[PDB]
């Protein structure tokens, strides 16, 4: 393949699959890739965040800077995991005030994490730490990774996220991965994951899932890939704004990372590991993850047999979790 991503992951599979038979590590190589400025045509006139993520590809064990070790110490039913970035307090604290609150409701263990990574200096990041340590020491939901958080980085989020729920919450029935911007109703996915039987809940995985999709060939877009780097359709995947799956099948997805190279556009990135482990996620019509009709905004019954809606902001969450509250006796 002339694209350089799928050139790599064709030799990645010939490494795990024998049947194919007929030397850096690509798993903790740290230092840059310098052969990526041979082999890849046009690689220095690409854009940084592309040059970054060649150069550091065969990169992904990153440790813990903070860590909540004792988050899973009672085998929780539903594990929230929650993607932001340093700045976002207000995201955090309104997730915490309503969707994402802690509960032990009909003894079903509801935890919730935060997944970060680091905003260093170096990038012009404003210094947030001590206000990132007082609000990790006060709420205790907030893991964070010594890697760089950025957009290209996001596939390093979700494997060392994954690495996580197989060394610190392999016994989370299921787990909700989501964007910090979207609302989610947790009582609608408690009652869903409730309803299904074993056989179904051993492989769940539902979302937004996009079907023949292609990366985009326009420079101008924020999800551009080039040629050089990417060729062919993605495989099926679940929009990244949220998507729900057991934790038997977590710990299926952490081990067949390992053989999937990191991708730029973190949600094809798990479809790319579904479809390796011979599985195909599920479109479930409760994720509206590019929102729902405006008329309807205003209606709190329309929130009712929702997922999650996308976008919201943290006013938004918090005034739409409260008239839910209420849904019951008005809708
Ligand atoms: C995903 O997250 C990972 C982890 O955070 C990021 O990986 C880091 O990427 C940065 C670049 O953004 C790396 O830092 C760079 O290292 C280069 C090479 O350093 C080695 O070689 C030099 C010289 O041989 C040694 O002195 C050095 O000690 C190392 O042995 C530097 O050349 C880089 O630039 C430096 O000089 C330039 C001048 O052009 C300055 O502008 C820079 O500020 C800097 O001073 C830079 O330091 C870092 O090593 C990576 N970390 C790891 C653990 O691999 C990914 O970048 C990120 N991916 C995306 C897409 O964001
Ligand atoms: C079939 C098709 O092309 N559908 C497109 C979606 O691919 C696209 O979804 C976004 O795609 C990028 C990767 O290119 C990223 O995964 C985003 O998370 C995901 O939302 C959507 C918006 O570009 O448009 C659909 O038409
Ligand atoms: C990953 O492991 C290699 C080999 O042990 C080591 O050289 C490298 O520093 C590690 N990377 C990180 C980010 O710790
Ligand atoms: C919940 O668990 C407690 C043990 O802590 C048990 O005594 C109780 O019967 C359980 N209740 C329900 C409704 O499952």
């Given at each position: 393949?002339?694209?350089?991503?799928?050139?790599?992951?064709?030799?990645?599979?010939?490494?795990?699959?024998?049947?194919?038979?007929?030397?850096?590590?690509?798993?903790?190589?740290?230092?840059?890739?310098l052969?990526?400025?041979?082999?890849?045509?046009?690689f220095?006139?690409?854009?940084?965040?592309?040059?970054?993520?060649?150069?550091?590809?065969?990169?992904?064990?990153?440790?813990?800077?903070?860590?909540?070790?004792?988050k899973?110490?009672?085998?929780?039913?539903?594990?929230?995991?929650?993607?932001?970035?340093?700045?976002?307090?207000?995201?955090?604290?309104?997730?915490?005030?309503?969707?994402?609150?802690?509960?032990?409701?009909?003894?079903?263990?509801?935890?919730?994490?935060?997944?970060?990574?680091?905003?260093?200096?170096?990038?012009?990041?404003?210094?947030?730490?001590?206000?990132?340590?007082?609000?990790?020491?006060?709420?205790?939901?907030?893991?964070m990774?010594?890697?760089?958080?950025?957009?290209?980085?996001?596939?390093?989020?979700?494997?060392?996220?994954?690495?996580?729920?197989?060394?610190?919450?392999?016994?989370?029935?299921?787990?909700?991965?989501?964007?910090?911007?979207?609302?989610?109703?947790?009582?609608?996915?408690?009652?869903?994951?409730?309803?299904?039987?074993?056989?179904?809940?051993?492989?769940?995985?539902?979302?937004?899932?996009?079907?023949?999709?292609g990366?985009?060939?326009?420079?101008?877009?924020?999800?551009?890939?080039?040629?050089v780097?990417?060729?062919?359709?993605?495989?099926?995947?679940?929009?990244?704004?949220?998507?729900?799956?057991?934790?038997?099948?977590?710990?299926?997805?952490?081990?067949?990372?390992?053989?999937?190279?990191?991708?730029?556009?973190?949600?094809?990135?798990?479809?790319?590991?579904?479809?390796?482990?011979?599985?195909?996620?599920?479109?479930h019509?409760?994720?509206?993850?590019?929102?729902?009709?405006?008329?309807?905004?205003?209606?709190?019954?329309?929130?009712?047999?929702?997922?999650?809606?996308?976008?919201?902001?943290?006013?938004?969450?918090?005034?739409?979790?409260?008239?839910?509250?209420?849904?019951?006796?008005?809708?």
């Open positions: 393949p002339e694209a350089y991503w799928n050139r790599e992951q064709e030799k990645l599979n010939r490494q795990y699959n024998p049947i194919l038979s007929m030397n850096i590590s690509h798993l903790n190589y740290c230092e840059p890739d052969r990526v400025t041979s082999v890849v045509t046009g220095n006139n690409l854009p940084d965040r592309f040059k970054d993520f060649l150069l550091y590809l065969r990169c992904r064990n990153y440790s813990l800077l903070i860590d909540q070790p004792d899973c110490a009672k085998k929780p039913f539903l594990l929230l995991a929650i993607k932001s970035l340093t700045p976002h307090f207000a995201r955090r604290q309104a997730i915490r005030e309503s969707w994402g609150q802690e509960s032990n409701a009909g003894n079903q263990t509801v935890v919730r994490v935060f997944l970060l990574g680091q905003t260093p200096p170096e990038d012009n990041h404003p210094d947030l730490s001590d206000m990132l340590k007082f609000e990790s020491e006060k709420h205790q939901d907030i893991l990774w010594n890697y760089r958080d950025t957009f290209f980085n996001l596939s390093l989020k979700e494997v060392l996220f994954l690495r996580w729920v197989s060394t610190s919450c392999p016994d989370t029935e299921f787990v909700f991965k989501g964007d910090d911007d979207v609302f989610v109703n947790t009582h609608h996915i408690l009652n869903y994951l409730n309803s299904l039987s074993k056989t179904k809940a051993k492989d769940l995985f539902i979302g937004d899932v996009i079907h023949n999709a990366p985009h060939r326009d420079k101008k877009l924020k999800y551009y890939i080039p040629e780097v990417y060729s062919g359709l993605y495989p099926p995947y679940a929009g990244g704004g949220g998507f729900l799956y057991s934790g038997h099948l977590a710990l299926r997805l952490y081990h067949i990372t390992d053989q999937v190279h990191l991708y730029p556009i973190d949600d094809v990135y798990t479809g790319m590991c579904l479809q390796k482990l011979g599985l195909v996620p599920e479109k019509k409760g994720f509206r993850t590019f929102d729902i009709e405006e008329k309807n905004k205003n209606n709190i019954c329309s929130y009712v047999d929702l997922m999650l809606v996308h976008s919201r902001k943290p006013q938004e969450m918090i005034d739409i979790w409260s008239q839910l509250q209420s849904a019951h006796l008005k809708c």
